[PDB]
Amino acid sequence: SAVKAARYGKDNVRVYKVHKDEKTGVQTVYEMTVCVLLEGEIETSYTKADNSVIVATDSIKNTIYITAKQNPVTPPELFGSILGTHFIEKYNHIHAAHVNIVCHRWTRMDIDGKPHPHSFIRDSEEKRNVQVDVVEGKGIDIKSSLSGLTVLKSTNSQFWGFLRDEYTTLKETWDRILSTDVDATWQWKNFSGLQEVRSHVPKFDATWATAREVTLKTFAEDNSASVQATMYKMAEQILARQQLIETVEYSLPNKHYFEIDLSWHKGLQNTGKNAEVFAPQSDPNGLIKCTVGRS
Amino acid sequence: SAVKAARYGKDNVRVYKVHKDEKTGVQTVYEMTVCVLLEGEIETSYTKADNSVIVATDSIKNTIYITAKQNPVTPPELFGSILGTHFIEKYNHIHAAHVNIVCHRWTRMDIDGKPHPHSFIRDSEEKRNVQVDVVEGKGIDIKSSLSGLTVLKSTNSQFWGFLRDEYTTLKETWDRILSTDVDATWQWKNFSGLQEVRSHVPKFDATWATAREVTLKTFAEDNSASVQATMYKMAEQILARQQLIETVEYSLPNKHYFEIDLSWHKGLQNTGKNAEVFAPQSDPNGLIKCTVGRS
Amino acid sequence: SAVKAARYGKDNVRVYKVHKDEKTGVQTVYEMTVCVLLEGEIETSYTKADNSVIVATDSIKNTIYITAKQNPVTPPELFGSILGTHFIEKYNHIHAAHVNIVCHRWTRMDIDGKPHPHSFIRDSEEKRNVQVDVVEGKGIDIKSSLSGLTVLKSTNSQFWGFLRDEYTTLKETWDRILSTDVDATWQWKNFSGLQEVRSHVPKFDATWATAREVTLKTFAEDNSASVQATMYKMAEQILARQQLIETVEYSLPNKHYFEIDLSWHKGLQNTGKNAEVFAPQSDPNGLIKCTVGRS
Amino acid sequence: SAVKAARYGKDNVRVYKVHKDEKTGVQTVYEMTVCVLLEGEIETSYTKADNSVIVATDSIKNTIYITAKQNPVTPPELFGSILGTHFIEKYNHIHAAHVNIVCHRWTRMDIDGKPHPHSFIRDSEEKRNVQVDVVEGKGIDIKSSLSGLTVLKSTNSQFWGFLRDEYTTLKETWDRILSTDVDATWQWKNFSGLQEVRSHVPKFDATWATAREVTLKTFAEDNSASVQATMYKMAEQILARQQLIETVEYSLPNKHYFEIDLSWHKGLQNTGKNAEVFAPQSDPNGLIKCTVGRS
């Protein structure tokens, strides 16, 4: 037998960094959870018990802290590219570094209508992520995403005209609840190295904001024919506004809210146009995925 | 042996209700998770296999939906009191009803600076809860609360002057991070029945808003001497502004963020005044509780 | 306003201890998660910012490790009583200690039919817990429990003869699935102090084993008339076999498994006696509780 | 823009099936959680709001229940292949079906040393999974796995001889705790269709048992030089015993247990050979992966 693939590192490394403006007294915090997996000429640590080729995962943890100390941690696309580049430049036998970053939300509090200088609030479990693959000789591939963005619209969603056969019981509808937890990923054009990543730094935060705004506005305003149709419109817009993006992938749960027939109780009307009370369903759930690129 | 206590019912009943303003076209959604436990003369269902005294938990589920259909579900203090009163009035052998309600956040989206009529966003995992105990002959006891309100301040927190003995290693500090997930409960004066609860309906939403505002403002502005000292100030204010409240209870985790000594690496300075990068600790965590009443 | 109640300490303190038999070479591991909350004359840490009365929670953490080093950690009833006694004896102003212990399962592996000397397997998420309240002048109150014991029987469960009115839709049944996650707690006679707790040490492990065996055997063999009726039989037996127990409390979810009517599809029969495929329900769920004592 | 990839279906479909032996009266239960995602000529549901090409996810749910009713659900490799084949044979425009199955453990209870005919116990959160990709014209690809198998050995694990530079603080050790949650996947030779899958049915359960036994025995007996070295030995054996397997992939967290230096307290010795009490670390954790194939 042979080692066909191998990667190892440190997962779930929690990092907090604070910036302090000496002038204004205004402090800004950043919190993230970092994973780094390395590949390279490390097969003999598996086959021969040869640990000389292993950069200990504890050392990898240390390197994450040190790197955060000496460099900006925002935007995460940049920090990840610095962190990954470090490993392939520092260690001659390590030819790829895979860096995953989950950014947690610490939003500045408004107290008495005024932004507070050093107090924050986790105003949502929504994340902002990046996956950075730094491969020696092949540049830097970056996938940005937002996840855990949970929304619901109480009307202006439809689902009719679908295939009906002997396995079908679902009734067509022209008015239903649509709720989902949005997972959106935009993959960037391959970058040649750190210098090129640095040259596009302003585009990362701007593109994250545009992806979020487009997702929210399109969800809210589209008279949805289906989750499929709605998510395609989102992806189409994001591509049109950032040429450095090659693809956009959406993954959307369809979190069902069932009508409750209460007519058995005193002829109470609670279906169709009379539907007020619904039963949210934990499971099962639809799962719709699409990857959209350029023609 | 004998039955000393017994209660049974339905837990985790998810409910969604929509209100539709025919005029403005503006829709408002409410989602909650409801638990109802009943007590009474039901001992023989345990001792004699006598199910004639059991109001099936499935029926209890049905009753929650029907009640939500026919009554307002906001404020939750009112809905809970209606739901609990129903069981003790309807069934002669059922002398107490315990109703727990967890309200989930569906916040109206702002699209292009304008409130959207029927789209929403789960803008936080923060909850608003109520525990309503309706006891026949003894009225209605209500405990309101907010939970999952997670905050962090990066400075203006201290902890020094504590007891030092041979079990102590903790260094005194005059500048640290303070982060917690707030759990606050305010217990109302016992109400005589539904009519009295109805008479104070406007006070429930107002008091929830005041408890939240006081918690946030006091956290942000207090130069904290300790979690103990800070939470007492919160409780003191809430009591002063709502006379119908008898007690206020806070339960606050102290979620630690440790300094990282990086001096072993090229004399890098990252402690004390030079501290920029911290390691958030998942566990363990301090746990501070206090119940404050009137003298 | 005034401080009506106050307690503070350390939660989620993970502890691992290994015992090594020098003779046999056989090692035994113990893992637990510990919480300690203290009460006493500590009101001025809340009201006056007086930290001199605070035994830092970090020190409490240290004390847990030290105590585990110097004492047996099994049975948990004993370890908890030692840990709690320590705080009220050591600190003159601390009059109560509340100690919660969650024991995790590390079961010795069988390799080739032979017990392995130092390898283990988490053979279930079932726990064994204790809550120990050590109050100065009032002795030691201990509540032992097992939790997360999840079972299912595919027949020999019934539910008929329950109350039917206009809120009832549930059909009577003489054959259904019964599944639950068992939570059982047995409260011991108050002990006068550590010496008395030590004198009954052998009874703690024996009584835990009996409570588990009785729960499992009664669940498996009882032709259940209801969850109520079945759980009472369990409690009755446990009381009969350990006179040092004052009460036994069960809390049992009724985790529903619904029949699926597939007759709409080619007259497929899947209900009643023909029921083979069921839909497990995540929520809602029945919740049945009972506390049984001695007459 | 264009649709580069698309798949949609139903996730988290919980299924329970019971088998009843009319002769012995012995009942056997199976529970699983199923996901089915379809691909094909369905791009116009995204681009043109054309739902005529959509086999509703609700219908997919129905089809899972019906299929379970009419076919064996064990081994899961077979059930998944039947379920996936159905979709590509039934619908002319659907060219691939992806079926994920998570099997939950319901282990027959032993009551009084005797197997009980219809009572079971969730004796672990360990799973048995399968991922089945049925592609029209390209056969059936099956990946079997076990996950959530959590183990710990208290000695006979080492880690020394690793790379040391200016980012290294980790001390070499010749005796440490090793604990992990095992994730093991074995990928089968591509099958031509259902008939070939049926012909190898006995090999699926046998190979799962061998993978589990090899994992446990090798973990327990190997004087581990590293997680890398140990997991390679496991993979090597599994390949040697089942020729129909092409690759074996392990993914192993290294769940750290830190020594606690208690010497600051009365010279208490708790490190090295004197180490008895450890602090389990929730995070961070090492993550080691390897894919092993045939040379």
Ligand SMILES: O=c1[nH]c(=O)c2nc(O)[nH]c2[nH]1
């Ligand atoms: O938007 C939807 N897309 C679907 O594919 C689908 N299938 C359903 O059963 N409902 C659905 N709603």
Ligand SMILES: O=c1[nH]c(=O)c2nc(O)[nH]c2[nH]1
């Ligand atoms: O605010 C605090 N209260 C405490 O009781 C405490 N104990 C610590 O170790 N730190 C602490 N911080």
Ligand SMILES: O=c1[nH]c(=O)c2nc(O)[nH]c2[nH]1
């Ligand atoms: O064992 C049961 N006890 C109950 O109270 C109950 N209520 C149901 O609807 N089903 C039930 N099953």
Ligand SMILES: O=c1[nH]c(=O)c2nc(O)[nH]c2[nH]1
């Ligand atoms: O088995 C191990 N493999 C590793 O790569 C490693 N790195 C550490 O720091 N410890 C480790 N233990």
Ligand SMILES: [Cl-]
């Ligand atoms: Cl769907």
Ligand SMILES: [Cl-]
């Ligand atoms: Cl604390």
Ligand SMILES: [Cl-]
């Ligand atoms: Cl029930």
Ligand SMILES: [Cl-]
């Ligand atoms: Cl590691």
Ligand code: NA
């Ligand atoms: Na390299």
Ligand code: NA
């Ligand atoms: Na009554």
Ligand code: NA
């Ligand atoms: Na004392």
Ligand code: NA
């Ligand atoms: Na086809």
